[PDB]
Amino acid sequence: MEQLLADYKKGNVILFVGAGVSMNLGLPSWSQLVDHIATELGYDPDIYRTFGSALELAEYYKLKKGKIGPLRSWMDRMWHSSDIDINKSKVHEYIAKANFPIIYTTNYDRWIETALSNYGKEYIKISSVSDIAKIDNNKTQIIKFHGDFDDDSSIVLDETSYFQRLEFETPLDIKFRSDVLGKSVLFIGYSLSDINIRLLFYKLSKLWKEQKLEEAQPKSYIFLPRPNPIQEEILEQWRIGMISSENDNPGESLEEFLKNFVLV
Amino acid sequence: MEQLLADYKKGNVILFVGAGVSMNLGLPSWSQLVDHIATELGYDPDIYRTFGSALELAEYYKLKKGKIGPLRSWMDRMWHSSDIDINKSKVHEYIAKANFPIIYTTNYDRWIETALSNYGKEYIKISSVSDIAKIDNNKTQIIKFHGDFDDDSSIVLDETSYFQRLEFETPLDIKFRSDVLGKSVLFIGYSLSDINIRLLFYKLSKLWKEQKLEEAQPKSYIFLPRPNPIQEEILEQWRIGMISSENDNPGESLEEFLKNFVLV
Amino acid sequence: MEQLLADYKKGNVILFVGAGVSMNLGLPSWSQLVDHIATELGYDPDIYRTFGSALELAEYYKLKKGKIGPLRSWMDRMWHSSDIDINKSKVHEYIAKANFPIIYTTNYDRWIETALSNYGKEYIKISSVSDIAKIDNNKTQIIKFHGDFDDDSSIVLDETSYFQRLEFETPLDIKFRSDVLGKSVLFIGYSLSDINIRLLFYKLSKLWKEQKLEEAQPKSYIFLPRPNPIQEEILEQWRIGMISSENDNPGESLEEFLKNFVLV
Amino acid sequence: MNIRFITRNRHKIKEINKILSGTGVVVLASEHSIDEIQTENVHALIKDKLLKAFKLVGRPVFVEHTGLYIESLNGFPGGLTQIFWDKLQADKFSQLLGTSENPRLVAKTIIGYCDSMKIYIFEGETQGTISPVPKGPRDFQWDCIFIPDGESETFAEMGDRKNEISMRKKAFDKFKEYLLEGGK
Amino acid sequence: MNIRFITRNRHKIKEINKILSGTGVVVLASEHSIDEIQTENVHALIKDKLLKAFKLVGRPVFVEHTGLYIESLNGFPGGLTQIFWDKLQADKFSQLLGTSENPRLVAKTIIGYCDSMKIYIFEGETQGTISPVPKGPRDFQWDCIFIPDGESETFAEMGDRKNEISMRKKAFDKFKEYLLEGGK
């Protein structure tokens, strides 16, 4: 915990962020992403959930519609609605005022980009290797790990694309390995509960420790509200620490957790 | 169906055996092991079942008690108790009377081997890499693909072990690829929500593609007791047709499915 | 010897065939092709074979005639001429009466297939990747590893397609690797001055040593009627043991060597 | 076209085979067990019972549930009609409410049907009165107390015309009407 | 050392601190919504309420349920006491059961405590009677009709003498005696 702030002073940590910061803003959840594209298919919103894990709805919807295009356009329209304000969410602005040089997101929206643009931080968003080139050493570099809505090809919403992301052959993963060959990863909002995710971590886990060679692959940490012993004992064998609070409401717990990085 | 019977007439089928076949035999459940493992760890069974998944907690017990030894001693004790009768299970009789040359399994027990011994058919158990030299083509080969109780190193009971198994780099995966290259493979007793078989199907596909062997490789099959159009449309992309039965009871459906191979 | 017969009783012997098996039939030699292409380009069949070595000479014939078309027609005419009797050779009879499940060959003729059809053995001839789906385990598999006269592109008669077969990435080599995984392999009718059999040995030895399965894979064997001590010494380092006969006439020596599998 | 049914009462399948005779659909029985939640919203009860049933079979299936709505109890039966029934029994229920000031109750059977595309809800209704004494047999449910409006006998007494005047007969009439037009 | 509580009641945040004073344990309050299943067996309700609570926080916590059991109804409400109270209210409860021949009833408060390793159940009981009219302020639960044994007034008329003879007070000094022993 203290070593995270010590390396955050030296800038040897990489922010990694999931949907846990995205549930605070009133964004559409994955449950209505199941309700839609089922009622847009002829199904009941329920009753598919007997046979599904929601990547299987993304499979069945892109298989019946032929492309991932209508699903991409629908989530781009709902995820970037007019009534939702960036400024009524302290966690996004706490990310914005912090000093993070490299930040990786698995979310597909651009609320982190508008959070950095709203507080005068100069960002160059990158998703395709191409962009990799344009990295303002200075400007923070936000990296869409699972793609964005401006690229229909490499966007990862589906079980086939999630299975293409097993062996990490895409050069964004190579850039991630090159970025974290001497640094740490701070994971936010990632409920170690869904196998895939867990797995994602696993594979990832490798990356660092993978090359325990010399270095020290600066430890890595995740932040969860619940302090369970199973996940910390499991995660400590992958060279990953565990950080939890005593507050039970997750939004306020994440706000007071990011408050440590706001003032430093 | 008739394509599977035509390939079974030619001997180009390979029987996978999952954990779902064992419900007729009255084996101890996974939940009973969770109850025992909480009692051994000094935890209430339901509250131990709450935090942690259905198999991480096995690695928590593995880390807390040094190694996998006492756990697999308990599995070997109650998984082969004398209260279990093997003649009463019709599905194991239908498996042993069928003309399956190669039978893969992910079960850690020995009831398929005991079922083959009970009906006068010679078996060869393969668990490690040294047993591949012991293959006789006049006997039915059994491969404990997830390990067996007589080898603690090859046991796959924990998340740390349940992982580099997925990269498909052990020599048993090379053996599996070598038998599967010309022949169809039949999967029974799988719940289809397991991540392992979905990674197996996806890796298979790719392989049998990058290796320009797309023209060669019959169609694989999986048995499910219920119809499922969503999963059938997904698994068709991995070139596997599902087989459904009209019986709602799963045991009678499985016995009626394996009836078709015994008579020939 | 005794271990080879013990593997033959277990059905783990895969048999190769060279030109030395087919030399007893009165088949045309390679010089019998060389004088035909020499008169085809108006060369003398000693001055043509001075500044070229067989495979090149076929390279030049293909390059001057544009394709291997007339060469394929000539080999298919004089290699299957009606005066050649298949019943008069004891070697092909002992090949047909032996219980060999898989037989590879580098010949381009059909006399192994004619010997199998002549002695009442059902066979499945495999020439390209499309024929792997027609594999039956009740019939003897014949793989024309060097191609046959029905397909022009799978023919290897020239030096450049010899090199194409020598980087070992064609799908027939994948089928070869998966077949030879568990079984010992017998080579008959070969000479050690050939480069491709030695490089095939080297590829097999490096491949096994690469993936950790060298404890499996009992050693392959080759039959040379003339004993060679240092060839046995070099082939011992690749796990191939030579077998030397005692009668100096090669035809009946090969006949009495192949006698050992007929009675079993 | 076959429609599955998940029950343990073996007279039910033959009864609805008699009801739906000549309707183009046969009814197949399922012998599994559905652990229903006990919530006073009977629509949510039939919804998650239908969800558990489609989890069990995966084919076109339907579920039914019989409830009560007593005006004097402000509709406290319904989601725990079965629990109320076996916790009280016939004589205690009769002296509790048949001797009371308001025996007006509404007996309703809610049928939830899924055709593997959507779910459909059918409900029947029958206004009844509470007897102060159990009459007839006490074999099947609260039929020994339930006196309809316009008649005198309790529902256990008449025999066969209770199968024509019940609320589940009307719900099966709307269900039969829905399947007889093609299920559009 | 701290033990949290999961409720949306304002008075409990100071009341449990007042009752459990001197133990060195401050009872914290969490403001999350709790969904409770509705079965008659109170032990499953306190069990799954504690299971969902411990899934919600992951720290050593406890949770409370208080229910009624009518002796004439063979203890029919149990854990359905709250929903039965919301369906009937005090005047219908009084006219239906407080004016009956047998207004004798049992009321038990069951405390379930989790120490993040085990589970513990504490149970307090106090018999009583149902008043035939609602007396006192009706704003606090069904206390306007509960007359305990040896007294004459309803439980809403008890005031600050309520926590001397109540069933919840017995559940809480069981909680206090187990907490003062080091949780052995």
mmCIF file of C-alpha atoms in Angstrom, chain B residues 32-241:
data_model
loop_
_atom_site.group_PDB
_atom_site.id
_atom_site.type_symbol
_atom_site.label_atom_id
_atom_site.label_comp_id
_atom_site.label_asym_id
_atom_site.label_seq_id
_atom_site.Cartn_x
_atom_site.Cartn_y
_atom_site.Cartn_z
ATOM 1 C CA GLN B 32 -19.608 -31.960 -0.360
ATOM 2 C CA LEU B 33 -15.875 -31.434 -0.826
ATOM 3 C CA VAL B 34 -16.423 -27.715 -0.189
ATOM 4 C CA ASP B 35 -18.249 -28.618 3.055
ATOM 5 C CA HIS B 36 -15.483 -31.033 4.094
ATOM 6 C CA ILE B 37 -12.771 -28.604 3.119
ATOM 7 C CA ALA B 38 -14.367 -25.813 5.174
ATOM 8 C CA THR B 39 -14.736 -28.172 8.142
ATOM 9 C CA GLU B 40 -11.063 -29.126 7.779
ATOM 10 C CA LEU B 41 -10.103 -25.465 7.470
ATOM 11 C CA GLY B 42 -12.262 -24.469 10.442
ATOM 12 C CA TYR B 43 -14.856 -22.565 8.416
ATOM 13 C CA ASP B 44 -18.608 -22.726 8.134
ATOM 14 C CA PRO B 45 -19.410 -24.392 4.770
ATOM 15 C CA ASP B 46 -21.850 -21.790 3.446
ATOM 16 C CA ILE B 47 -19.708 -18.800 4.380
ATOM 17 C CA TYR B 48 -16.689 -20.512 2.834
ATOM 18 C CA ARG B 49 -18.790 -21.079 -0.277
ATOM 19 C CA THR B 50 -19.653 -17.352 -0.410
ATOM 20 C CA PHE B 51 -16.281 -15.635 -0.831
ATOM 21 C CA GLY B 52 -14.084 -17.356 -3.386
ATOM 22 C CA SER B 53 -15.203 -19.403 -6.376
ATOM 23 C CA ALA B 54 -15.937 -23.125 -6.577
ATOM 24 C CA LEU B 55 -12.289 -24.026 -7.168
ATOM 25 C CA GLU B 56 -10.072 -21.245 -5.987
ATOM 26 C CA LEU B 57 -10.815 -22.253 -2.414
ATOM 27 C CA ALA B 58 -9.135 -25.559 -3.303
ATOM 28 C CA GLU B 59 -5.941 -23.612 -4.002
ATOM 29 C CA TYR B 60 -6.507 -21.730 -0.750
ATOM 30 C CA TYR B 61 -6.524 -25.089 1.031
ATOM 31 C CA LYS B 62 -3.473 -26.129 -1.015
ATOM 32 C CA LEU B 63 -1.546 -23.039 0.079
ATOM 33 C CA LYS B 64 -2.737 -23.254 3.687
ATOM 34 C CA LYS B 65 -1.847 -26.950 4.042
ATOM 35 C CA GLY B 66 1.439 -26.845 2.157
ATOM 36 C CA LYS B 67 0.547 -28.941 -0.887
ATOM 37 C CA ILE B 68 -2.134 -30.926 -2.712
ATOM 38 C CA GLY B 69 -1.450 -34.163 -0.752
ATOM 39 C CA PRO B 70 -4.130 -34.319 1.987
ATOM 40 C CA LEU B 71 -6.847 -32.993 -0.384
ATOM 41 C CA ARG B 72 -6.197 -35.695 -2.987
ATOM 42 C CA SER B 73 -5.922 -38.256 -0.182
ATOM 43 C CA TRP B 74 -9.482 -37.298 0.749
ATOM 44 C CA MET B 75 -10.580 -37.455 -2.913
ATOM 45 C CA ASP B 76 -8.966 -40.878 -3.284
ATOM 46 C CA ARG B 77 -10.634 -42.110 -0.102
ATOM 47 C CA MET B 78 -14.244 -41.084 -0.695
ATOM 48 C CA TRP B 79 -14.125 -41.288 -4.493
ATOM 49 C CA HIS B 80 -13.511 -45.053 -4.355
ATOM 50 C CA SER B 81 -15.497 -46.137 -1.324
ATOM 51 C CA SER B 82 -16.968 -49.634 -1.249
ATOM 52 C CA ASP B 83 -20.537 -48.281 -1.028
ATOM 53 C CA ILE B 84 -20.440 -47.453 -4.756
ATOM 54 C CA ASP B 85 -21.605 -50.309 -6.977
ATOM 55 C CA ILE B 86 -20.493 -50.177 -10.597
ATOM 56 C CA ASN B 87 -22.836 -52.796 -12.081
ATOM 57 C CA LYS B 88 -25.902 -50.660 -11.360
ATOM 58 C CA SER B 89 -24.788 -47.777 -13.615
ATOM 59 C CA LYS B 90 -26.053 -48.478 -17.128
ATOM 60 C CA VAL B 91 -24.102 -45.641 -18.744
ATOM 61 C CA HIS B 92 -20.713 -47.065 -17.712
ATOM 62 C CA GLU B 93 -21.830 -50.456 -19.028
ATOM 63 C CA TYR B 94 -22.779 -48.836 -22.338
ATOM 64 C CA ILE B 95 -19.393 -47.091 -22.420
ATOM 65 C CA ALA B 96 -17.499 -50.321 -21.729
ATOM 66 C CA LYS B 97 -19.466 -52.342 -24.273
ATOM 67 C CA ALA B 98 -18.941 -49.793 -27.043
ATOM 68 C CA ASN B 99 -16.096 -50.077 -29.541
ATOM 69 C CA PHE B 100 -14.272 -46.947 -28.446
ATOM 70 C CA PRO B 101 -10.546 -47.300 -29.208
ATOM 71 C CA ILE B 102 -9.391 -44.146 -27.406
ATOM 72 C CA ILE B 103 -11.269 -42.751 -24.404
ATOM 73 C CA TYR B 104 -10.135 -39.416 -23.025
ATOM 74 C CA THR B 105 -11.383 -38.262 -19.653
ATOM 75 C CA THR B 106 -11.084 -35.370 -17.243
ATOM 76 C CA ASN B 107 -12.276 -37.452 -14.302
ATOM 77 C CA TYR B 108 -9.788 -38.071 -11.536
ATOM 78 C CA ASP B 109 -11.450 -41.328 -10.479
ATOM 79 C CA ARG B 110 -10.888 -44.832 -11.833
ATOM 80 C CA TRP B 111 -14.486 -45.866 -12.467
ATOM 81 C CA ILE B 112 -14.092 -45.957 -16.251
ATOM 82 C CA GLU B 113 -11.105 -48.280 -15.819
ATOM 83 C CA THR B 114 -13.015 -50.382 -13.294
ATOM 84 C CA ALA B 115 -15.992 -50.433 -15.663
ATOM 85 C CA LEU B 116 -13.759 -51.712 -18.449
ATOM 86 C CA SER B 117 -12.278 -54.311 -16.099
ATOM 87 C CA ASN B 118 -15.735 -55.409 -14.965
ATOM 88 C CA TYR B 119 -16.826 -56.333 -18.506
ATOM 89 C CA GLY B 120 -13.697 -58.199 -19.569
ATOM 90 C CA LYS B 121 -12.172 -55.534 -21.814
ATOM 91 C CA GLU B 122 -8.473 -54.767 -21.485
ATOM 92 C CA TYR B 123 -7.544 -51.178 -20.673
ATOM 93 C CA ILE B 124 -4.337 -49.151 -20.501
ATOM 94 C CA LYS B 125 -4.234 -46.082 -18.272
ATOM 95 C CA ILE B 126 -2.144 -43.147 -19.490
ATOM 96 C CA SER B 127 -1.484 -40.300 -17.087
ATOM 97 C CA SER B 128 2.097 -39.169 -17.675
ATOM 98 C CA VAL B 129 4.481 -39.044 -20.616
ATOM 99 C CA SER B 130 6.161 -42.376 -19.848
ATOM 100 C CA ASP B 131 2.966 -44.355 -20.427
ATOM 101 C CA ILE B 132 2.723 -43.474 -24.132
ATOM 102 C CA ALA B 133 5.333 -46.158 -24.809
ATOM 103 C CA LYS B 134 3.030 -48.699 -23.124
ATOM 104 C CA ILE B 135 0.298 -48.330 -25.765
ATOM 105 C CA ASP B 136 -1.076 -51.585 -27.158
ATOM 106 C CA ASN B 137 -3.415 -51.268 -30.124
ATOM 107 C CA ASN B 138 -5.394 -54.363 -29.107
ATOM 108 C CA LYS B 139 -6.533 -52.673 -25.871
ATOM 109 C CA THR B 140 -8.636 -49.591 -25.191
ATOM 110 C CA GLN B 141 -6.481 -46.595 -24.275
ATOM 111 C CA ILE B 142 -7.629 -44.458 -21.345
ATOM 112 C CA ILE B 143 -6.041 -41.042 -20.919
ATOM 113 C CA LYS B 144 -6.558 -39.188 -17.663
ATOM 114 C CA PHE B 145 -6.206 -35.854 -19.444
ATOM 115 C CA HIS B 146 -6.502 -33.842 -16.217
ATOM 116 C CA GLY B 147 -4.303 -36.167 -14.177
ATOM 117 C CA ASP B 148 -4.973 -38.933 -11.718
ATOM 118 C CA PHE B 149 -4.710 -39.677 -8.010
ATOM 119 C CA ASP B 150 -1.404 -41.551 -8.319
ATOM 120 C CA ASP B 151 0.519 -38.442 -9.441
ATOM 121 C CA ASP B 152 0.361 -35.224 -7.432
ATOM 122 C CA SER B 153 2.311 -33.231 -10.025
ATOM 123 C CA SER B 154 -0.162 -33.908 -12.847
ATOM 124 C CA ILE B 155 -3.228 -33.197 -10.687
ATOM 125 C CA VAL B 156 -5.375 -30.308 -11.903
ATOM 126 C CA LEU B 157 -7.380 -29.202 -8.861
ATOM 127 C CA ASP B 158 -6.231 -25.605 -8.344
ATOM 128 C CA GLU B 159 -6.359 -22.346 -10.312
ATOM 129 C CA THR B 160 -2.555 -22.229 -10.587
ATOM 130 C CA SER B 161 -2.629 -25.710 -12.103
ATOM 131 C CA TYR B 162 -5.900 -25.058 -13.911
ATOM 132 C CA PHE B 163 -4.132 -22.665 -15.988
ATOM 133 C CA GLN B 164 -0.963 -23.497 -17.804
ATOM 134 C CA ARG B 165 -3.108 -26.480 -18.685
ATOM 135 C CA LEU B 166 -5.017 -24.067 -20.961
ATOM 136 C CA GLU B 167 -1.921 -23.069 -22.974
ATOM 137 C CA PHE B 168 -1.867 -26.690 -24.304
ATOM 138 C CA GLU B 169 1.873 -27.231 -23.950
ATOM 139 C CA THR B 170 2.019 -30.458 -21.937
ATOM 140 C CA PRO B 171 2.882 -33.559 -24.027
ATOM 141 C CA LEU B 172 -0.563 -35.016 -23.354
ATOM 142 C CA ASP B 173 -1.939 -32.153 -25.455
ATOM 143 C CA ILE B 174 0.445 -33.197 -28.244
ATOM 144 C CA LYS B 175 -0.869 -36.758 -27.920
ATOM 145 C CA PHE B 176 -4.451 -35.428 -27.964
ATOM 146 C CA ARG B 177 -3.779 -33.385 -31.106
ATOM 147 C CA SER B 178 -2.230 -36.426 -32.769
ATOM 148 C CA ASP B 179 -5.255 -38.646 -32.202
ATOM 149 C CA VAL B 180 -7.764 -35.903 -32.992
ATOM 150 C CA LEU B 181 -6.163 -34.911 -36.370
ATOM 151 C CA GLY B 182 -7.893 -37.548 -38.476
ATOM 152 C CA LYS B 183 -10.865 -38.440 -36.280
ATOM 153 C CA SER B 184 -14.012 -36.901 -34.858
ATOM 154 C CA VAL B 185 -14.305 -36.404 -31.107
ATOM 155 C CA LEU B 186 -17.439 -36.920 -28.999
ATOM 156 C CA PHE B 187 -17.940 -34.969 -25.768
ATOM 157 C CA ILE B 188 -20.333 -36.258 -23.112
ATOM 158 C CA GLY B 189 -20.955 -35.159 -19.540
ATOM 159 C CA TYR B 190 -20.013 -31.501 -19.956
ATOM 160 C CA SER B 191 -22.099 -28.610 -18.672
ATOM 161 C CA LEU B 192 -21.000 -26.212 -21.510
ATOM 162 C CA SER B 193 -20.419 -23.318 -19.064
ATOM 163 C CA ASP B 194 -16.910 -24.617 -18.366
ATOM 164 C CA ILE B 195 -14.269 -22.318 -19.843
ATOM 165 C CA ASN B 196 -11.839 -25.210 -20.455
ATOM 166 C CA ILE B 197 -13.788 -26.946 -23.216
ATOM 167 C CA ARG B 198 -14.530 -23.636 -24.962
ATOM 168 C CA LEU B 199 -10.812 -22.822 -25.063
ATOM 169 C CA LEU B 200 -10.285 -26.418 -26.212
ATOM 170 C CA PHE B 201 -12.722 -26.034 -29.116
ATOM 171 C CA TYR B 202 -11.316 -22.654 -30.128
ATOM 172 C CA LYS B 203 -7.698 -23.842 -30.021
ATOM 173 C CA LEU B 204 -8.647 -26.881 -31.924
ATOM 174 C CA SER B 205 -10.238 -24.861 -34.601
ATOM 175 C CA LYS B 206 -7.400 -22.559 -35.121
ATOM 176 C CA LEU B 207 -4.918 -25.353 -35.196
ATOM 177 C CA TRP B 208 -6.793 -27.352 -37.718
ATOM 178 C CA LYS B 209 -6.826 -24.226 -39.803
ATOM 179 C CA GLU B 210 -3.479 -22.617 -39.634
ATOM 180 C CA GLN B 211 -2.325 -26.066 -40.502
ATOM 181 C CA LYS B 212 -4.226 -25.902 -43.727
ATOM 182 C CA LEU B 213 -5.871 -29.102 -42.656
ATOM 183 C CA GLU B 214 -9.334 -27.547 -42.949
ATOM 184 C CA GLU B 215 -10.342 -29.945 -45.671
ATOM 185 C CA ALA B 216 -9.389 -32.726 -43.306
ATOM 186 C CA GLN B 217 -11.146 -33.137 -39.980
ATOM 187 C CA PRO B 218 -14.548 -34.419 -39.601
ATOM 188 C CA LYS B 219 -17.093 -32.689 -37.499
ATOM 189 C CA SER B 220 -16.793 -32.916 -33.736
ATOM 190 C CA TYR B 221 -19.838 -33.438 -31.544
ATOM 191 C CA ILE B 222 -20.980 -32.642 -28.006
ATOM 192 C CA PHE B 223 -23.940 -34.152 -26.163
ATOM 193 C CA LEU B 224 -26.352 -31.872 -24.314
ATOM 194 C CA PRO B 225 -29.595 -33.160 -22.754
ATOM 195 C CA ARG B 226 -31.488 -29.975 -23.528
ATOM 196 C CA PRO B 227 -31.871 -28.129 -26.835
ATOM 197 C CA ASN B 228 -30.023 -24.848 -27.061
ATOM 198 C CA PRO B 229 -30.142 -22.864 -30.334
ATOM 199 C CA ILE B 230 -27.854 -20.063 -29.110
ATOM 200 C CA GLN B 231 -25.060 -22.399 -28.056
ATOM 201 C CA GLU B 232 -25.592 -24.505 -31.186
ATOM 202 C CA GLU B 233 -25.118 -21.436 -33.384
ATOM 203 C CA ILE B 234 -22.025 -20.433 -31.396
ATOM 204 C CA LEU B 235 -20.476 -23.926 -31.432
ATOM 205 C CA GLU B 236 -21.127 -24.248 -35.175
ATOM 206 C CA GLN B 237 -18.455 -21.548 -35.639
ATOM 207 C CA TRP B 238 -16.025 -23.943 -33.920
ATOM 208 C CA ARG B 239 -17.295 -26.702 -36.259
ATOM 209 C CA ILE B 240 -19.102 -28.701 -33.573
ATOM 210 C CA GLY B 241 -22.719 -29.737 -33.924
#
